[PDB]
Amino acid sequence: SMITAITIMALYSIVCVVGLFGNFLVMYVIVRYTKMKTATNIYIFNLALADALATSTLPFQSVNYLMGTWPFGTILCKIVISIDYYNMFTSIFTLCTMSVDRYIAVCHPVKALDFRTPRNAKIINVCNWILSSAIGLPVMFMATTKYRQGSIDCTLTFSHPTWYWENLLKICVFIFAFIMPVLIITVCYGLMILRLKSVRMLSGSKEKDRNLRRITRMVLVVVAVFIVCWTPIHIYVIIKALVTIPETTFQTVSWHFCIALGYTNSCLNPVLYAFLDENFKRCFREF
């Protein structure tokens, strides 16, 4: 009981601290030195902002679990839930947009000249934030506080019939957060790997071959981290909604572990994207 609570609190605390430290470090490196002069820097900054907000909403979830009630109030409940869903979809759509960007950069270079500009990146990013706001606003309206068993609960409220709109929202979140992003990332990076293999420059000498190897390994690490992070929480939500399984301590541990594994992608996106990039590596090497 106590050991489980200490484990859950330590898990949420470690994930939040490492995620905030990485996101603010990437923000400081981009704003202080690079100053957003290229499109890729703009996308990495937008990932940093979305992941920072998503990890910032996490200690309120930790306080909610630890206290067993919601003392913050209805308005802050609305703000935190809306920011959570909004920045989750913002981060996922920004990952999809970077996958499309690298696909157009490798496979279609003449159209990548027109496509890869700072202005177009700003336009597509603003479109991504607006498409996230499309679900951020109704979730903001729905989120209320309910008095259950003497405890305030910060939760979504659905109009009658509750089951239809609730499961429609679960199905839409599952589809647009899992089915389409995995397809976009997998198809675009697979075509990218095939085109890079086709490139005469990457083939030939052992050193260039090794470099192509390194690049393909990076691509597979990115795809694997995305799948391994976002897959279990979605499958577990689908199983929980479809099949009522009896309450146990193992259910609580698995639920919070799947939530932490879902936020682990937002935590690990700085290390995966910004730090591994050669240009930022040179920036750390110099300064």
Binding site: R102, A105, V106, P109, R116, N211, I215, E278, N279
Partner: peptide
């Protein structure tokens, strides 16, 4: 473009 994205 690969140098700009940061792979090279």
């Amino acid at each position: 473009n690969l140098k700009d994205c940061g792979l090279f």
